[PDB]
Every structure is written in structure tokens, then in C-alpha cells.
Amino acid sequence: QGNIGQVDIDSVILGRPGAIGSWELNNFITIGLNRVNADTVRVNIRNTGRTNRLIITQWDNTVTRGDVYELFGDYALIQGRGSFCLNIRSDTGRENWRMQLEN
DSSP states (O other), X not given: OOOTTOEEOXXXXXXXXXXXXXXXXXXXXXXXXXXXXXXXXXXEEEEOSSOEEEEEEEEEEOSSSOEEEEEEEEEEEOSEEEEEEEEOOTTOSOOOEEEEEOO
């Protein structure tokens, strides 16, 4: 920082600064995303269970290979309340951003 289980996060990644969303990814983990400025999306975590991992990807459909992704990053999710930030520009040409838990 600084498919079953995947959710579309374009509402925040491709939104103007100010954009906010919140997802319950399983019974233990809630992830809020908030584009706090033009350069940055804050990930807000509440995890009431064991350590898990968040995996952020960006998808495209191709003519030859079907759906393919690029890995943006992946991040430990310890128990408790915390956050970290992603450097992703508000005006990116990339779409179909997704997040999912590892486990």
C-alpha cells in the first residue's frame, strides 16, 4: 500500500473524488472504498475474524483469450479496524476493477 467472490468496484475507482462504497465480502469482513482525492483510494477494513487477504484486479475481455486480468495488488487483512491507500488516478483509462477475498 501507500468469478465467485469478486465484486465490481468501478463505482469508486472510476468515480470522482468523494465517491464512497461499502461491501460485506463475507460474515467477518466489511470493506469500504472511498476516493479521497484525485490520486488516491482509501480502503477501510473491519474484520471481526481471522486474518484474510484482499486481492485487487482489473479485467478486460479479449478476442482471443476470453476474460483476463491484471493484478493491481494484494493486502493482508488482520483482525480489527484499519485502512490503507491505493494510488490509482481518477482519470485512468482502465475499467472493470474488482476486489475479492483470498479465503
